[PDB]
Design a binder for this molecule. Structure first.
Ligand SMILES: CC(=O)N[C@@H]1[C@@H](O)[C@H](O)[C@@H](CO)O[C@H]1O
Ligand SMILES: CC(=O)N[C@@H]1[C@@H](O)[C@H](O)[C@@H](CO)O[C@H]1O
Ligand SMILES: *[C@@H]1O[C@H](CO)[C@@H](O)[C@H](O)[C@H]1NC(C)=O
Ligand SMILES: *[C@@H]1O[C@H](CO)[C@@H](O)[C@H](O)[C@H]1NC(C)=O
Ligand SMILES: [Xe]
Ligand SMILES: [Xe]
Ligand SMILES: [Xe]
Lengths: 532, 532
C-alpha cells in the first residue's frame, strides 16, 4: 500500500486526497515529539518514543494553544488565520503530502507557518500542500511548533524554561524529516525550508543557528527575516516579560523555580488571557513571547553573526509584499478601520509613528515623521495613510530583509529576490490595505488553481508561475529553467542588486529595492538613536 | 541749475549723465560721515561736519578697503564685483541719481551692496542707478559702509571697537537721506531700502534694530536674510576672532586697549592679508568680520525678535535665485572648477558637505548627506554636483529666508515673494553654475536695456518687468498695477504661502518654496544638533 509507510519511529497509515481531478497520498498528524505537557511545559522538546502497530495519519492534528483573533467574528479575512482545529498543548505534529505514485527520492519542501510567534497553525486551508505537491511533484511537509509563552517563555539561566523552545520544536521536526523522509520518497539531501513572516524569520534563524544548519539544503523567506525588530529580544527583556507574566497571574516571584512552578499549574487560556499585558511599550507589530539571543541557539548577536558570515552558506530565495504594514495599522493604530478608506489626519499620523517605532526618542520620531511626510500637502489623509503603511512595512519587514539580504549575499552561494505586488481580484479586505501581509501565500500554495475560489485566469497563471519558481529553486537552487523560453529571474548580487516584481504583468527587473528608505532605517536612525 | 543742490550739510554740484538716448542728473560721492580714519578706525561713525562752498559731486568716490578677488584675473565674471576705484578708509559716501527735470517729491530707493560683509562697492557698473532712476522716475540712492575688520571688528564691552559699526554707517547714510533727500526731489516718507546677500541681510537687520526702523518705509531683500547662518556671530565669537586677528599680526593681547591700539597702527592691507585666518572652521560661505548680537543694535537674539514680532511692521518684497550655492563651491570645495562640468565624486561630495555645514557633528553631516543623496545612483557626478549646490544654497540663503518670511508675515502688513530662475543668455560663467548668486542684480538695475550688453529682447522685457515691480512696490507697497491687464503677483500669506517665478516665461504661481528641505534645515537639523 501507497498509504502505508514504515518509519524509524513506527508505521504510519495515510489517506488518499483528491486534488485537481486527480489524487495523492496524505500523511496527517504525525508526531515528531513527546507531548510537551505538564512538567514539560516550557521545556525543550523530547523526541517521540517509537510506537508498535500503525499510526493513523488520516486526519489533521490539534493546533497549539494560542491567542485567537475575534476582532472580526465571522469575517473570512481574519478567521482564515485562526486555528481550525481543537487547540491543545499536545500539538507537535507534522503533515506530509506525497505524489502518487510514491516518488523514489525527490525534492522536499518544509513549510514553517507564521503568526508573530504568538500564533499559527499547520492545518489552515491556505496551507494545504496537496496542490503544490501535486502540481510540482514534490514531497510537501508542514511542521508545527509551540507559540506564545508555551514556546518562547525565557528565564535565561534555568533549564526548565530556557527560551527558544518553539524553535527547537521546528528543529526537531526538521530532524525527523532528515531521518525519515526517505521512506515517503523524499530526498533528505535536498530539503528546502520555507516560511512567511515569523516563519520566514524562523527560516533565517535556522540558517544562523549552528545547530540547525545541517538539517536542510536551501531556504525561502517570505516577508520575514531573522533580524526583524519584532523577531527577537535580549535575555534580560525576555526575563522581565516572564516575570511580568507571573505578576499578572499572582505568581510567587521569589525565584525562577517558584515562578515556573506557578505558570505550569495555570490553564493555557489563563496564560493567553494576559499575554499582551507584558509588552514594554504601547506599540504595533510587537509580540510578547519571541526568540531570545541566548548565546546557545544564537551564539552571538545576529548583526555579529551576519557581519562575520557566521551562517549556513547556500542558496536563498526571498522577497516581500507591497503593503506589509496595513494589517497592523488596521488592528492597532488610530484612524484605521475595516469599512472606511481610512483617510488619516496629521494627529493620527504622528500617533501612528509613535506606535510604529516604540523604541525611539522624540528626535527619532521627528526623523521618521520628516522622511515620510510630503510637506507640500501634509494634511492629505490618503498620503498620511499611505506613508504610515510604508513606515510600518519598511521598518518591520522590508528594510530588515534588505539588510539580511545584502549581508547574506556577500558569503552565500546564490540569492534570488522578489517584490510581490498583485492585489488579488477576490480580496475581502478593503482596497486601502493593498497587497497585504500574508496574501502571497495563497499563490504559493496554488489556491488560484481551484475554480470555486473565484480567481481570474491571470491569477491562476501567476500562481502556477510562482509554484514552479519555488519548486524549481528547491530542486536545483535556481528558480529559472535553464532550457526555457520564458524570461529570466536574475541573481541578486552585491554589485547590481537586481530583483523582479511578481504579478500578472510581464516580468520587469529592478534594482536596489526601497534603498532610499532602508538607508534611513538600517543606517541613520539606529545611529541617531545611539548618539541620542 | 538742476545740478546745484543746497542740503543741510552744504551745497553740492552734480553732473548730467546720458542714459538710453536721454539724460539725468547724478550727484556722486557725497559724504555722510567724517572719515573713519586714524584713531577713529573701528569706531562708530560720526556725522560729517557741514561745509562752506560747493561740494563737487561729479565723480564716483573711493571704495572701502577690502579683500580683492584675484582668483580669476582678467575674467569679467569675478572682476565685475571687485572695487573699480582706489580703495581707502575714507570711503563713507553716497550717490544719488535724480530724474530730469528734478522731481518735487517722489519715490526714493536706497541700495545697500552685498559682499559677505568683507567686501563690496557702491560704484560697480552693475549697480549704476541711472537706468532705474530714469526708467521708473525714482530718485535712486546707493550708500557705502565699512566692511571686513574695519567695519565689524567686535570687542564687546569696549567703546573703541564695539562692533556693528558698518551697520551704523548704513544707518547714518539712511539718516542723511531722511533729512536731505527732499532737496533732491525725493519723498523721505516714501523710502524703500533694498540690497542683495549681505545687503539683503542688512536690510532685514534695519527692520529688526529699533534704531533704524524709523528711517525708511519698506524693504526689499534679495538673496539674503538677517538670520542667515553667516550673517552674524555672538559677542564671544566676535571677540575670539578679534584676538586671533591680533595674534596674526603680533599684537599685544594683555587687554582690549593694547589690542586695539596695535590694530589701529597697522596698514589696511596688513589687516586684510590675515583676515581669513581667524575663521573657527574649515568652511565655505563663512566670513570673518560680521555683525554681532550685541544687545544694542540687536537688543536680543534674532529668533527671539522674530518670534515675538519685535520688528518694523510694514511691507516687504523678497526672493532668491535658483543656484545660490554654486559660487561658493567653485571657489572653495574640492572637485569644482571654472572650466569643467565639475562632475563630483562621492568623496568630494561628502567633503563638500563637511565644508558646507562646518558646525555640525558627524550625525548631522550624515543627516545632510542622507537628505541630498539619491541612493539609487549615489555615484552620479552630476547629481552629486547638483545636490551640493542645493545644500549650500538651501542652508545659507533660501531656507533662512523662508524662515524669516514665515516669521515676518505673521505680523507684517504685506509680503511678496519670488524665485528668480533665468539663466542669462550672455553669462560668462559655466552652465553648471546655473542661476548664480548676484545675477539677478543686473536685471534689477536694467542693464539688459543697453544694446551693447548683448541681452536678448526677452531679457530686456524681463528687466523692464522687474524694475517696474520693484519701483511700483516702492511707491505703493504692492508690485502690481491695480488697473493692469498683466497677471498678478499674489500676496504671500501664512495660509497659502504663494510665490511667483521670475523669468522670460509667462508668470506661474507656486506655493511653499522648497518646503521639504527647509523643514529639514529650519526644524530638524537644529533640533538634532542641540540634542546631540
Ligand atoms: C469562493 C467564494 O468566495 N465564492 C463566492 C461566494 O462567496 C458568493 O456567494 C458567490 C458569488 O457571489 O459564489 C462565489
Ligand atoms: C557686451 C559684450 O560682451 N560684448 C561682446 C564682446 O565681448 C565680443 O567681443 C563681441 C561679439 O563676440 O561683441 C559682443
Ligand atoms: C556556488 O558554489 C559553486 C561551487 O563552489 C560555485 O562554483 C558557484 O560559482 C557559486 N555560485 C554563486 C552564485 O556564488
Ligand atoms: C495693511 O495695513 C492696513 C491698515 O492697517 C490694513 O487695512 C491692511 O489690511 C493691511 N494689509 C495686509 C496685507 O495686512
Ligand atoms: Xe510570492
Ligand atoms: Xe533625516
Ligand atoms: Xe529679481
Amino acid at each position: 500500500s501507497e498509504l502505508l509507510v514504515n518509519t524509524k519511529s513506527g508505521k504510519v497509515m495515510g489517506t488518499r486526497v483528491p486534488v485537481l481531478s486527480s489524487h495523492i497520498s496524505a500523511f496527517l498528524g504525525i508526531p515528531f515529539a513527546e507531548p510537551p505537557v505538564g512538567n514539560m511545559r516550557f521545556r525543550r522538546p523530547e523526541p517521540k518514543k517509537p510506537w508498535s502497530g500503525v499510526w493513523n495519519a488520516s486526519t489533521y492534528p490539534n493546533n497549539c494553544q494560542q491567542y485567537v483573533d475575534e476582532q472580526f467574528p465571522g469575517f473570512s479575512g481574519s478567521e482564515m488565520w485562526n486555528p481550525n482545529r481543537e487547540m491543545s498543548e499536545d500539538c507537535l505534529y507534522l503533515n506530509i503530502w506525497v505524489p502518487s505514485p510514491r516518488p523514489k527520492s525527490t525534492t522536499v519542501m518544509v513549510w514553517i507557518y507564521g503568526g508573530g510567534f504568538y500564533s499559527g497553525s499547520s492545518t489552515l486551508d491556505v496551507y494545504n500542500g496537496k496542490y503544490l505537491a501535486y502540481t510540482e511533484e514534490v514531497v510537501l511537509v508542514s511542521l508545527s511548533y509551540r507559540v506564545g509563552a508555551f514556546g518562547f517563555l525565557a528565564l535565561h539561566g534555568s533549564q526548565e524554561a530556557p527560551g527558544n523552545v518553539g524553535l527547537l520544536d521546528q528543529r526537531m521536526a526538521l530532524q525527523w524529516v532528515h531521518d525519515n523522509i526517505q521512506f515517503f520518497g523524499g530526498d533528505p539531501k535536498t530539503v528546502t525550508i520555507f516560511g512567511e513572516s515569523a516563519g520566514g524569520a524562523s527560516v533565517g534563524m535556522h540558517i544562523l543557528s549552528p545547530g540547525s544548519r545541517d538539517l536542510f539544503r536551501r531556504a525561502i523567506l517570505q516577508s520575514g527575516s531573522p533580524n526583524c525588530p519584532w523577531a527577537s529580544v535580549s535575555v534580560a527583556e525576555g526575563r522581565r516579560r516572564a516575570v511580568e507574566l507571573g505578576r499578572n497571574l499572582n505568581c510567587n516571584l521569589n525565584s525562577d523555580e517558584e515562578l515556573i512552578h506557578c505558570l505550569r499549574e495555570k490553564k493555557p487560556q489563563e496564560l493567553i488571557d494576559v499575554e499582551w499585558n507584558v509588552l514594554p511599550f504601547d506599540s504595533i507589530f510587537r509580540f510578547s513571547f519571541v526568540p531570545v539571543i541566548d548565546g546557545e541557539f544564537f551564539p552571538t548577536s545576529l548583526e555579529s553573526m551576519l557581519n562575520s558570515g557566521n551562517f549556513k552558506k547556500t542558496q536563498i530565495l526571498l522577497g516581500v509584499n507591497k503593503d506589509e504594514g496595513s494589517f497592523f495599522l488596521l488592528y492597532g493604530a488610530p484612524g484605521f478601520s475595516k469599512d472606511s478608506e481610512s483617510k488619516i489626519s496629521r494627529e493620527d499620523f504622528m500617533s501612528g509613528v509613535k506606535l510604529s517605532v516604540p523604541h525611539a526618542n522624540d528626535l527619532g520620531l521627528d526623523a521618521v515623521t520628516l522622511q515620510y511626510t510630503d510637506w507640500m500637502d501634509d494634511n492629505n489623509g490618503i498620503k498620511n495613510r499611505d506613508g504610515l503603511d510604508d513606515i510600518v512595512g519598511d521598518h518591520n519587514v522590508i528594510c530588515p530583509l534588505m539588510h539580511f539580504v545584502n549581508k547574506y549575499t556577500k558569503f552565500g552561494n546564490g540569492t534570488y529576490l522578489y517584490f510581490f505586488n498583485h492585489r488579488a481580484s477576490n480580496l475581502v479586505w478593503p482596497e486601502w490595505m493593498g497587497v497585504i501581509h500574508g496574501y502571497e501565500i495563497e499563490f504559493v500554495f496554488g489556491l488560484p488553481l481551484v475554480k470555486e475560489l473565484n480567481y481570474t485566469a491571470e491569477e491562476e497563471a501567476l500562481s502556477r508561475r510562482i509554484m514552479h519558481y519555488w519548486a524549481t529553486f528547491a530542486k536545483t537552487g535556481n528558480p529559472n529553467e535553464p532550457h526555457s523560453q520564458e524570461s529570466k529571474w536574475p541573481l541578486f548580487t552585491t554589485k547590481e542588486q537586481k530583483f523582479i516584481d511578481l504579478n500578472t504583468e510581464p516580468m520587469k527587473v529592478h534594482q536596489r529595492l526601497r534603498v532610499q528608505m532602508c538607508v534611513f532605517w538600517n543606517q541613520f536612525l539606529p545611529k541617531l538613536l545611539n548618539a541620542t
